[PDB]
């Protein structure tokens, strides 16, 4: 209207969008900086970059944008686009975005007293260190460092307001514990003046329901299935087939864990050593199966069973695991004697083979017990060694 | 021409593209906002972002862009590019695009009465919560929240017009149920004035023909093939080979389901638990096969069959499943006696082995029936537990 | 030079780049629109977006850009960049690009008579419906809809010129049948004036040499190899091994077909049902192998062969498939009688087992013939059911 | 300084950045165009797009940018950014980049005589036809076509200077043979004036060390391992296991070759037919193994060996491949006769089975020789059929 | 304020942002160039491009931006955006970014003496040669070449300041040894004037903990498991099954190494030849297993054991590896003689078969020892042949 047009023409006249809108040129300009977290887009641990949707909030007082409400009836707020009024140069210090700004420049509301208000949105890409030591029971502290690029503490001092949690969309993968912030002053050995900045520490923890059901339970079931080799009879030649097939199945799980894990080489991930232990147990089960088959397929009278081997396997382990089984009339006679002698020799050889097979079965059951104990101990210890494991289980699975 | 050039030179003179084109500066400016959905580009459930091709429609009245048709014959409409006339700052609140605008700024048609008209296109990227609880029988309600960034209800009030469905290209993957909208007013504890906005809720459901034929039918056939282990004779040593190979085949299906599913950890997807049940059934079939082979390859006289084992397997289950099968003249005689005695002992051992093998076959058939029942029950229950399953089947497969 | 500088200074003076360059402000401005297709970048059937390299061609007459050649010797053409002279706002209606323009704005040549000429290049991203019903023997009709955004038929009427095929780089994957176009007028229930637009329908067909050699021939060979199970003797326990391994091999082909196919759920792709039929045949071969092994490994005297089973398998199918094979002196005698009686019983059991094995071989050969017939019929019928299959084969493979 | 500021203020005055800087407006302006290739970023054969880092070099003479060195001491060169002085509109005709320009606009150095100099860098994306007929022994001729967009030969004629090879970073994958160029004139049937352009043909060949060690040697070793089936004895039932496993291993190599090859359907790649031949040989080896096992597991007296079969396998092939192996006293006698008669019958059956097994071994060795010859011939012929194969081997492997 | 506005209005007046701010127009302008490395984003060896987050630091003296502090109380620093004051055109020469600039243009602080200060951030993408000869024990020297685009040494000479390591975020994958820099002058055969530039050589080494635990240890364990074939008895037919399965497992490791390695064909990577040696050892183990099974399954009296074969295997290798095992009354007699003669012949054949089996076992143990030695030697030699292997192990694993 008439009054709004007159006000807009009056305010722009003799206004420099480069000068700091202070009335004395020496007193610092107080700028209240805060943000409003909306959602966490994707925590890319591969490149150690955090992508978030954040609405910044800046509020300062302008001395040259003040008018009288009575003299200009009706109009109470004026908005200026970029390049028309002075704005603070606050931007993310650790921004990993290519543009390095990642802010949509909107208008700046101005009240009758000149109190400007700036709410620039944007999909920020911060760069924070991401440790995967306790993956997937992981808690991350990503930091957003905001501050004026070319203003000191005696010209533009930052004042902090608490972040706005209201309106935050809950990310499925990550749970937001909170976003505490702190205002800090950095000094240089030039001028003895502060360089304040406002930094917000995004504290988030990873949810383990999806990662659990996709990596932990399948691994446990696969290891328990690999333990089945010791129950198959040695007569059927499919023991090492099952062992090598279950190890081949674990290979693709190892590949998946490698593809989802970063290339960080500062610590060993918990799930990495868990999978390593599981695959090592499977390989040792394969070796044990080879030994058991070597015992089972022992040549008749091809060797002598050692006394220690007997007294251990056939007695002590048998009792421990409840085992129980450890003229022409002369020529015809001389000819028929050989058949029965050969049959007796075959029976003795069969008895020796039966002893060897029972020793193999004893080794099978002993290794079944030992590997079950090892698998249970390794799984429980590795899973419960992670901090806040009980909290994550009670909050995800329950 | 002459008249059009004169009109363009007259309208621009003494015009501020920053002022709101109201005649009183206090009466609110009515802006009619609506959109025209064209197609759904891609529903990215991984990042919970919806990509759509939308033509916005804005219509307001400008007081300073009115002329006389008689005084300017021929010209009835004038178009101004960005930065030359005032436009509303309506933009998507929950836009996940990096630019946060995602609108191609076009010209604004102006009638003789000053009624402006704005139709900015753009590939919007909204951020909506996407639940995968009932995947793939899934219905999504994605929300598009539009509103003025820096205008209240007493200066620029939004009026809603129904979305334009005409011209919508049917997306292959998703079926558009509809796009209802609502106008809501948000109040602050500052000024007791409304802050209206227009939000459109895109209601879409996923089609299950592709997902069905790629995930459900192959899984059913794979489970039915895994059930074949109980039909193979135990004489051929290829039972656990088939079982472990079919489980290895299910492993890649699990990997695919993990790759197409988001990392959301708020609920267990229906197809996720379906695949888990199928693979658990396959693993239990492998365990049962191990038990059956242990029964089949039982050493002759290496143990005693328990009385309960006999009375169950060889009688009750046999009847339930229709089983039927549960001087020198003295020396020659003494020598030939041993051969027949050994043959009789071998025959008795063979009879015991036959009893054990029949018990193994009985267990095989019992487990075949039990696992067929379990697979059918699990598949039917999980598939029919999802809401609107019948609608999706009748609309996709028929 | 002097004359060119004078002409440039004269033309710009009193020129508005916003007015339509018509001499009467009521007669429509004729704009001749045409394009010049250069190459097809990538037909992304996943998102139903077509990417092409197109040089647009626009020609209109400007009334205010006319000068005298004699008065300005030497200079015959003047070029103005964007924002200096009026240009039509023609753009792709169904553009799926984020910028929605995808045009590099070049200069506009102007002749002495004011006939402007505009050739803006650009990598357009159109959105066309892509059906995969007859994949890979597929013919696509993608549509490029061009028209003025904010001009009617009484101010800027579009005139169509045929597309320029000369200079088109032949895309390897797709063969360009042609690009016919049509000019259509859309009417609104407001003003009874046309809204013309020029739309070009890109008609292209997919070449099947690469898709053939990568998907069809390997599938045929894999199915023919799966047919080999019926030729292996049942004595060697590696039948179901071969069957399950060939099915596992087909699994990755199914995964590839799923990865290259869109998520469209409006029709079943031809190659999809072809692969489904092949894998179903392989699974049925596995089931048949299980049945054959069940027949082969039949216990001696563990059951009675049914009369119908005999009269079918051992006679009718045997003839159909040319099968041919369907004091102390008393004690010694009484003792030796048992050995020969046991041997006779073993021989009878061996004869019964031989009958069962011959029945298994007969079933093997019958199923070999039946599955060969089924595979041939399914492959030929599915491949030849597609339209223009003969054209694609004669144009790709020959 | 003073003189530089005076010169800059003088040159800009009465200067139009739109006019061609010629002194007569009819004589053509000579522009010397050349480029300086730095590196080849990536040759994307999938989309037939070449990405290169190129520094363009343009030099023309400006008539209005001449000053006196004595009158302006110290200053000898002036630089103007974009939009301040006239520049040629030379750009890549076949640019596949979305922006279609892909040039970073820098300043233009001007000497005292007005000789301008322009060196705009940029990551160009040209579109060249890429044939994969002789992959990986491939030589590509990608073309970069540069020319003025809206200038003829009588206003702006292009003069060519040889490309600058100095400073070219050697790309690891591709070897740069050279970049010859040619200046050509295109005529239209309008005006009988040339339209010159400068095109540079980038001639590059692919290095085969990486592709060799990753695709050729592994394939050769895999085929040689597949040849081992004929050496395994038929007693162990693991022949077809090895054959089908090696074929399954070749399947992933086929998948890799498909993933690295474009979708071009104009010719069959050399490595494609090489892999096809290798996999066909493996499949034929599997079929031969099936035949050999059918011969080996032949039922005793289940058929008659044909006379031709005998005279070939047991004699001619045996000699060719050095094979060598082709009252109560009556009752007891009548009872014991049967045992020896049965043993004699078993011995005759064993002799027949031994003949069949020797025939199977003869077939095994014959097929070993034949398949070794076939594999060697196919590999050598396919590898040496490619042109410049010897050059690529001597330059990569040596 | 008043003084700041007056100063800003005074400085801009009669200022040309194109002239070099020197007081004599002949003396060179000293520009101090330095950078501040923050983090290494990703070292993409595939395209030989290095992505880093770098804050540039430029400092020069401006003659026209000097004012009096006393005359303008309070204001001590003024900031000008892009296009308002002269700035050096320093940019990365070897930038591989599409924009080629990759710098966020910020304000330029100016002191009372005119000493400007420029700190433009940006995510630079340099192009450096990346050799993978010693992967993963790799040390890279990537070079960042900065220099003025269109200024010589007599107008704008570059002065170098050491790079700022403080504030560098430690990248997980790469360890930063240091970033030494050097200032060099390039001369042309035109003018005998220097063209200085400042280049920083980023020296970084790859950490081997992740690559170690994912590629080296699994390969060692897989090779050691492949060595287990020689321990399995030949009676169980699962030797070549284990060998071919472990080779199939190594196939996916080869695929992973190919996917993570660049396409460079100038040298053979260390891990590439390591994996090649491991897979060659596995293949040779498979061949040895085939030979061993051929020896084990030798037909009775189907050939004669060579004298050299005996004296080697059964004696010398047996001792080397501690092996130990290398009227009617006439008719009945004549009938019973045959049974014992046949049994004696069978016993002799069994003895020959036992000799062959012992020879096979001797070959098995000899090959076990030989392949263990070969695997150990190859692994140790290849791993320790890389330079700084001990440093990388002591710094990553310890
Ligand atoms: N999560 S991970 O870091 O990617 C990962 C997962 C599993 C795994 C490793 C790494 C390697 C580190 C330790 C052993 C090695 C491997 C293995 C291979 C063969 C056998 Br027999 C036994 C064990 N197991
Ligand atoms: N769709 S999914 O969420 O990716 C998915 C699919 C299948 C599946 C799971 C997850 C895991 C969760 C439950 C068991 C576990 C796994 C499994 C592994 C070995 C055996 Br023996 C039996 C069962 N089955
Ligand atoms: Ca993530
Ligand atoms: Ca999707
Ligand atoms: Ca495609
Ligand atoms: Ca490539
Ligand atoms: Ca990397």
Author numbering:
A (entry chain A), B (entry chain E), C (entry chain D), D (entry chain C), E (entry chain B): 23 to 348, 431 to 502
What's in the article?
The α7 nicotinic acetylcholine receptor (nAChR), a pentameric ligand-gated ion channel, plays important roles in cognition, neuroprotection, and anti-inflammation. Ago-PAMs can both directly activate and allosterically modulate α7 nAChR. Here, we present cryo-EM structures of α7 nAChR in complex with the ago-PAM GAT107 and Ca2+ in the open and desensitized states, respectively.
In the desensitized-state structure, all the domains in the receptor together with the molecule GAT were well resolved. Specifically, the brominated aromatic group of GAT inserts vertically in the pocket and is in close proximity to M301 and I302 in (+)-M3 and L243 and I244 in (–)-M1. Moreover, the sulfonamide group of GAT points upwards and makes electrostatic interactions with N236 in (–)-M1. This results in a typical desensitized channel pore of α7 nAChR, with the lower half resembling that of apo-α7, and the upper half more similar to that in the open channel. The transition from the open to the desensitized state is coupled with TMD rearrangements, resulting in a contracted channel pore, especially in the lower half of the pore. GAT molecules are located in the intersubunit TMD and maintain the upper half of the pore in a relatively expanded conformation.
